[PDB]
Enzyme design. Structure first.
Site, PDB file in Angstrom:
ATOM      1  N   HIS A 497       9.408  33.188  12.865  1.00 22.10           N
ATOM      2  CA  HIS A 497       9.948  34.099  13.479  1.00 22.10           C
ATOM      3  C   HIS A 497       9.059  34.965  14.746  1.00 22.10           C
ATOM      4  O   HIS A 497       9.586  35.248  15.910  1.00 22.10           O
ATOM      5  CB  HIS A 497      10.771  35.012  12.695  1.00 22.10           C
ATOM      6  CG  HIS A 497      11.240  36.421  13.004  1.00 22.10           C
ATOM      7  ND1 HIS A 497      12.463  36.463  13.420  1.00 22.10           N
ATOM      8  CD2 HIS A 497      10.654  37.297  13.217  1.00 22.10           C
ATOM      9  CE1 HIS A 497      12.809  37.701  14.021  1.00 22.10           C
ATOM     10  NE2 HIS A 497      11.678  38.223  13.762  1.00 22.10           N
ATOM     11  N   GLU A 498       7.867  35.226  14.217  1.00 23.10           N
ATOM     12  CA  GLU A 498       6.856  35.956  14.912  1.00 23.10           C
ATOM     13  C   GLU A 498       6.383  35.223  16.020  1.00 23.10           C
ATOM     14  O   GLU A 498       6.018  35.491  17.093  1.00 23.10           O
ATOM     15  CB  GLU A 498       5.663  36.533  14.046  1.00 23.10           C
ATOM     16  CG  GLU A 498       6.158  37.631  13.149  1.00 23.10           C
ATOM     17  CD  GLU A 498       6.861  38.810  13.859  1.00 23.10           C
ATOM     18  OE1 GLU A 498       7.040  38.871  15.062  1.00 23.10           O
ATOM     19  OE2 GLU A 498       7.803  39.333  12.925  1.00 23.10           O
ATOM     20  N   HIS A 501       8.794  34.830  19.204  1.00 22.94           N
ATOM     21  CA  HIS A 501       8.981  36.192  19.838  1.00 22.94           C
ATOM     22  C   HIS A 501       7.915  36.117  21.149  1.00 22.94           C
ATOM     23  O   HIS A 501       8.130  36.667  22.073  1.00 22.94           O
ATOM     24  CB  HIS A 501       8.494  37.128  18.882  1.00 22.94           C
ATOM     25  CG  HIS A 501       9.459  37.997  18.422  1.00 22.94           C
ATOM     26  ND1 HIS A 501      10.947  38.227  18.943  1.00 22.94           N
ATOM     27  CD2 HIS A 501       9.768  38.829  17.100  1.00 22.94           C
ATOM     28  CE1 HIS A 501      11.601  38.940  18.034  1.00 22.94           C
ATOM     29  NE2 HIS A 501      10.863  39.167  16.995  1.00 22.94           N
ATOM     30  N   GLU A 557      16.209  38.693  18.818  1.00 19.67           N
ATOM     31  CA  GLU A 557      15.888  38.713  17.343  1.00 19.67           C
ATOM     32  C   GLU A 557      16.650  37.384  16.928  1.00 19.67           C
ATOM     33  O   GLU A 557      16.261  36.572  15.882  1.00 19.67           O
ATOM     34  CB  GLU A 557      16.217  39.799  16.498  1.00 19.67           C
ATOM     35  CG  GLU A 557      15.193  41.131  17.020  1.00 19.67           C
ATOM     36  CD  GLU A 557      13.832  41.007  16.632  1.00 19.67           C
ATOM     37  OE1 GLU A 557      13.264  40.237  15.943  1.00 19.67           O
ATOM     38  OE2 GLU A 557      12.956  41.813  17.005  1.00 19.67           O
ATOM     39  N   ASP A 561      14.759  34.154  15.244  1.00 19.56           N
ATOM     40  CA  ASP A 561      15.519  33.742  13.979  1.00 19.56           C
ATOM     41  C   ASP A 561      15.723  32.278  13.928  1.00 19.56           C
ATOM     42  O   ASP A 561      15.205  31.300  13.060  1.00 19.56           O
ATOM     43  CB  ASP A 561      16.921  34.330  13.560  1.00 19.56           C
ATOM     44  CG  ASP A 561      16.584  35.876  12.992  1.00 19.56           C
ATOM     45  OD1 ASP A 561      17.540  36.411  12.890  1.00 19.56           O
ATOM     46  OD2 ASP A 561      15.246  35.926  12.511  1.00 19.56           O
ATOM     47  N   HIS A 622      18.260  43.461  15.633  1.00 20.50           N
ATOM     48  CA  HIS A 622      18.366  42.561  14.684  1.00 20.50           C
ATOM     49  C   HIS A 622      19.945  42.418  14.151  1.00 20.50           C
ATOM     50  O   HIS A 622      20.721  43.302  14.226  1.00 20.50           O
ATOM     51  CB  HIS A 622      17.709  42.877  13.187  1.00 20.50           C
ATOM     52  CG  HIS A 622      16.217  43.118  13.458  1.00 20.50           C
ATOM     53  ND1 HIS A 622      15.648  44.229  13.986  1.00 20.50           N
ATOM     54  CD2 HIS A 622      14.951  42.487  13.557  1.00 20.50           C
ATOM     55  CE1 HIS A 622      14.488  44.224  13.944  1.00 20.50           C
ATOM     56  NE2 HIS A 622      14.032  43.169  13.779  1.00 20.50           N
ATOM     57  N   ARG A 628      22.386  36.790   9.997  1.00 19.08           N
ATOM     58  CA  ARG A 628      21.150  36.127  10.191  1.00 19.08           C
ATOM     59  C   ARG A 628      21.004  34.626   9.773  1.00 19.08           C
ATOM     60  O   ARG A 628      20.237  33.745  10.398  1.00 19.08           O
ATOM     61  CB  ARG A 628      20.018  37.174  10.006  1.00 19.08           C
ATOM     62  CG  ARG A 628      19.875  38.221  10.691  1.00 19.08           C
ATOM     63  CD  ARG A 628      18.670  39.193  10.492  1.00 19.08           C
ATOM     64  NE  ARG A 628      17.734  38.756  11.078  1.00 19.08           N
ATOM     65  CZ  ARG A 628      16.380  39.674  11.419  1.00 19.08           C
ATOM     66  NH1 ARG A 628      16.414  40.718  10.803  1.00 19.08           N
ATOM     67  NH2 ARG A 628      15.343  38.951  11.896  1.00 19.08           N
TER      68      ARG A 628
HETATM   69  C1  LIG Z   1      11.439  38.527   9.386  1.00 18.68           C
HETATM   70  C2  LIG Z   1      11.019  40.046   9.072  1.00 18.68           C
HETATM   71  C3  LIG Z   1      10.291  39.916   7.695  1.00 18.68           C
HETATM   72  C4  LIG Z   1      10.142  40.774   9.851  1.00 18.68           C
HETATM   73  C5  LIG Z   1      10.888  41.013  11.259  1.00 18.68           C
HETATM   74  N1  LIG Z   1       9.794  41.694  12.053  1.00 18.68           N
HETATM   75  P1  LIG Z   1      10.378  41.636  13.819  1.00 18.68           P
HETATM   76  O1  LIG Z   1      11.619  41.717  14.084  1.00 18.68           O
HETATM   77  O2  LIG Z   1       9.441  41.039  14.187  1.00 18.68           O
HETATM   78  O3  LIG Z   1       9.716  43.103  14.445  1.00 18.68           O
HETATM   79  C6  LIG Z   1      10.536  44.339  13.998  1.00 18.68           C
HETATM   80  O4  LIG Z   1      11.647  44.672  14.856  1.00 18.68           O
HETATM   81  C7  LIG Z   1      11.039  44.971  16.153  1.00 18.68           C
HETATM   82  C8  LIG Z   1      12.425  45.104  17.034  1.00 18.68           C
HETATM   83  C9  LIG Z   1      10.533  46.077  16.232  1.00 18.68           C
HETATM   84  O5  LIG Z   1      10.120  46.646  17.442  1.00 18.68           O
HETATM   85  C10 LIG Z   1       9.079  45.833  15.557  1.00 18.68           C
HETATM   86  O6  LIG Z   1       8.208  46.652  15.793  1.00 18.68           O
HETATM   87  C11 LIG Z   1       9.483  45.539  14.082  1.00 18.68           C
HETATM   88  O7  LIG Z   1      10.022  46.594  13.387  1.00 18.68           O
HETATM   89  C12 LIG Z   1      12.179  42.009  11.140  1.00 18.68           C
HETATM   90  O8  LIG Z   1      13.056  41.354  11.511  1.00 18.68           O
HETATM   91  N2  LIG Z   1      12.221  42.850  10.828  1.00 18.68           N
HETATM   92  C13 LIG Z   1      13.387  43.738  10.747  1.00 18.68           C
HETATM   93  C14 LIG Z   1      13.890  43.827   9.265  1.00 18.68           C
HETATM   94  C15 LIG Z   1      12.969  44.210   8.110  1.00 18.68           C
HETATM   95  C16 LIG Z   1      11.572  43.642   7.729  1.00 18.68           C
HETATM   96  N3  LIG Z   1      10.944  44.537   7.004  1.00 18.68           N
HETATM   97  C17 LIG Z   1      11.785  45.505   6.960  1.00 18.68           C
HETATM   98  C18 LIG Z   1      11.164  46.789   6.048  1.00 18.68           C
HETATM   99  C19 LIG Z   1      12.156  48.069   6.343  1.00 18.68           C
HETATM  100  C20 LIG Z   1      13.275  47.808   7.379  1.00 18.68           C
HETATM  101  C21 LIG Z   1      13.670  46.478   7.787  1.00 18.68           C
HETATM  102  C22 LIG Z   1      12.745  45.650   7.669  1.00 18.68           C
HETATM  103  C23 LIG Z   1      12.934  45.476  11.024  1.00 18.68           C
HETATM  104  O9  LIG Z   1      11.613  45.540  10.891  1.00 18.68           O
HETATM  105  O10 LIG Z   1      13.786  46.041  11.339  1.00 18.68           O
HETATM  106 ZN   LIG Z   2      11.857  40.135  15.448  1.00 20.62          ZN
END
Ligand SMILES: CC(C)C[C@H](NP(=O)(O)O[C@@H]1O[C@@H](C)[C@H](O)[C@@H](O)[C@H]1O)C(=O)N[C@@H](Cc1c[nH]c2ccccc12)C(=O)O
Ligand SMILES: [Zn+2]
Ligand SMILES: OCCCCC(CCO)CCCCO
Length: 660
Positions: A497-498, A501, A557, A561, A622, A628
């Site tokens: 996923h990362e 990006h 996103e 995914d 997301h 997802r």
């Molecule tokens: C695949 C997952 C493990 C991590 C994944 N990180 P990622 O989307 O790469 O990146 C996240 O979303 C971006 C839009 C922001 O700008 C980033 O800074 C970060 O918040 C994500 O979808 N995060 C969501 C869902 C999520 C993961 N951990 C969380 C903790 C609390 C709330 C939501 C989450 C989010 O951060 O919104």
């Molecule tokens: Zn992401």
């Protein structure tokens, strides 16, 4: 065995075998969990991330409540910050006085009582640099998108006391969070010496009106996706013509002190007409109102640190929108706690294994890059080249595990016993100075925009870096005893996923060195855009509670995914290719390759507030958790082969999308 057996049980618990996987795999995987788990008291949206975060908090209590005082300055300061906020016998003894005092040092506000002063840019300078507030606009320092080895000043929109511009605009007609937000303003107006409601109501209403214009002038996040088109660099002389209301060189020279700013300072501005519109809006409105607005911002930032009359106010409103300060401490001093956090939670083993898993996901991602039919070979070569250069961090940043270096970073923060509010403000001023101090330094990759105990992950386009906090390198994502199928399905997917990006509708616009600059031929860019339209078309087919899911809005996103599910599965095939099949889980009726897809889906098991879903559906980039799962699985031939979903079952669309 007993670990396999416990893990099988929880898998099995979560599912709904009355549902057919090829009809709806999410329901099939999570329907059990959904129906069992209700959204608890303090939460409005619950799931894996909610769950693990709270497990961590509880670990942070025992770390922070040490007796041995056998920790570093920085770590010692978090302990002090913690005790200070937890001493609430003291906080009930202070009441509004701390904030109620702070205000007058700033010059007061018409809520107490009359107010009439020529103090605008002054109080503007103070609240932004000292109390880390952002009325009118937000100013800060990060990498220059077009020159990633430098930091630059950046001015952007801000100053809304609600989470989103649409609560001000939609809700007027669709349910009155406006009533609930004016209330909250009114009651805090009381707590801070406002007496008669007839006197507070109007004042606080004018702030609301102004806050809605802020939101009227503000730019919808759809008009803020594409950085190439919204990045605008101007000189400080250009900024001064653009927004004449602020006297910028003096302003910048005061908040970026000790750095000197002259007319040739570069400033990245994300919307020119906004800032023009701010200036006119500033020069046009009376000053008391300007002052009252500014203090209100200050109070929104600050009220959390006062007594239980306010907490009640914050709680009440959040039901419309005492672990309390284990959060606060992590929030502000999270790098201060990191060492404690990872000593407790993170086998160093874990770092090494996570590092091999990352290599393996990159490998697979790259093997997909080599094979992608929509790119010419030349474009595939550049992409591999940027893939190859992706930097990763695991667990923690290096500098925090060197107390000399971590203590240096926190040396100018001082925490006082029993003075929680003073401690906070001191931190706000400290935090502002850390950002200001970066202006003439180089960005580096050892600096994270996430602390180690966080349950999340990210990619930076300017550092070309993928980051995984030790806080997510936990179950269900990772567990070293866990079957590979489940590790490749959890963390492995988070990794892919990362990586993906780096190449999404945003990250592809930045080259391998982190610079915003065309590095593909337009033809390849036109070709990329066509693959992506499939996922637009696809994800706009989804709906929730009789309302569409936005396919353009969620594209980035979704792209990530899809690339990551796919890289993780290939990687897991790679592992089985080298090593040979592990054994199967017992009660399950499922092979390991099916277990992969199932584990993946169970990460995203979640419930949320009926309002939240109407809302996330417009604010969250997301996709809703269920789509997802479904949107990802639906683009996978390999998911369908393995659950033998017929030629056009729901979970097996003939129009499959593929970008990475
Ligand atoms: C695949 C997952 C493990 C991590 C994944 N990180 P990622 O989307 O790469 O990146 C996240 O979303 C971006 C839009 C922001 O700008 C980033 O800074 C970060 O918040 C994500 O979808 N995060 C969501 C869902 C999520 C993961 N951990 C969380 C903790 C609390 C709330 C939501 C989450 C989010 O951060 O919104
Ligand atoms: Zn992401
Ligand atoms: O190795 C360099 C580390 C410097 C640490 C700061 C850099 C911010 O970009 C952040 C620390 C948190 C302050 O709130």
């Amino acid at each position: 065995s007993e670990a396999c057996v416990s893990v099988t049980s929880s898998i099995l618990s979560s599912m709904d075998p009355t549902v057919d996987p090829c009809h709806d795999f999410f329901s099939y995987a999570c329907g059990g969990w959904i129906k069992a788990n209700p959204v608890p008291d303090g939460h409005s949206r619950w799931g894996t991330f909610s769950n693990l975060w709270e497990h961590n908090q509880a670990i942070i209590k025992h770390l922070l409540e040490n007796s041995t005082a056998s920790v570093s300055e920085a770590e010692r300061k978090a302990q002090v910050y913690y005790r200070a906020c937890m001493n609430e016998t003291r906080i009930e003894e202070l009441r509004a006085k701390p904030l109620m005092e702070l205000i007058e040092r700033l010059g007061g506000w018409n809520i107490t009582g009359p107010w009439a002063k020529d103090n605008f840019q002054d109080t503007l300078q103070v609240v932004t640099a000292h109390y880390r507030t952002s009325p009118f606009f937000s100013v800060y320092v990060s990498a220059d998108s077009k020159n990633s080895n430098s930091n630059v000043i950046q001015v952007d929109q801000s100053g809304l006391g609600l989470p989103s511009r649409d609560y001000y605009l939609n809700k007027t007609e669709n349910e009155k969070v406006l009533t609930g937000y004016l209330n909250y303003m009114v009651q805090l107006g009381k707590l801070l010496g406002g007496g008669d409601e007839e006197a507070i109501r109007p004042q606080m209403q004018q702030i609301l009106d102004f806050e809605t214009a802020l939101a009227n002038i503000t730019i919808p996040q759809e008009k803020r996706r594409d950085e190439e088109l919204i990045y605008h660099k101007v000189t400080a002389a250009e900024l001064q013509t653009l927004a004449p209301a602020i006297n910028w060189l003096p302003f910048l020279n005061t908040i970026f002190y000790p750095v000197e700013i002259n007319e040739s300072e570069p400033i990245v501005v994300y919307d020119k007409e906004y800032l023009e519109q701010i200036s006119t809006l500033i020069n046009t409105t009376d000053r008391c109102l300007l002052n009252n607005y500014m203090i209100w911002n200050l109070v929104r930032k600050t009220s959390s640190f006062l007594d239980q009359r306010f907490q009640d106010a914050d709680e009440k409103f959040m039901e419309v929108m005492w672990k309390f300060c284990v959060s606060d401490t992590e929030n502000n001093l999270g790098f201060a706690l990191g060492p404690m956090f990872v000593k407790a939670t993170f086998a160093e083993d874990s770092k090494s294994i996570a590092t091999e898993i990352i290599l393996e996901i990159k490998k697979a991602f790259e093997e997909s890059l080599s094979t992608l039919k929509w790119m010419d070979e030349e474009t595939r070569k550049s992409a591999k080249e940027k893939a190859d250069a992706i930097y990763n961090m695991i667990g923690y940043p290096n500098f925090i595990m060197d107390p000399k270096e971590l203590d240096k970073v926190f040396n100018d923060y001082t925490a006082v016993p029993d003075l929680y509010f003073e401690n906070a403000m001191r931190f706000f001023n400290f935090s502002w100075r850390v950002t200001a101090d970066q202006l003439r330094k180089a960005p580096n990759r050892d600096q994270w925009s996430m602390t180690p105990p966080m349950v999340n992950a990210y990619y930076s386009p300017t550092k070309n870096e993928i980051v995984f906090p030790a806080g997510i390198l936990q179950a269900p994502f990772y567990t070293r005893s866990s079957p590979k199928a489940l590790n490749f399905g959890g963390i492995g997917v988070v990794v892919g996923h990362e990586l993906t990006h780096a190449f999404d509708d945003q990250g592809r616009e930045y080259d391998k060195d982190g610079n915003l600059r065309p590095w593909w031929k337009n033809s390849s860019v036109e070709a990329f855009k066509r693959q992506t339209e499939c996922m637009v078309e696809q994800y706009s087919n989804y709906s929730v509670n009789g309302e569409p899911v936005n396919g353009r809005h969620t594209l980035g996103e979704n792209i990530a995914d899809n690339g990551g599910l796919k890289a993780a599965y290939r990687a897991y095939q790679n592992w089985v290719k080298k090593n040979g099949a592990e054994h199967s889980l017992p009660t399950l009726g499922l092979t390991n390759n099916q277990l992969f897809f199932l584990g993946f889906a169970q990460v995203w098991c979640s419930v949320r507030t009926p309002e939240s879903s109407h809302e996330g559906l417009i604010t969250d980039p997301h996709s809703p958790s269920r789509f997802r799962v479904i949107g990802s699985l639906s683009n996978s031939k390999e998911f369908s082969e393995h659950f033998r979903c017929p030629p056009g079952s729901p979970m097996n669309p003939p129009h499959k999308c593929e970008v990475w």
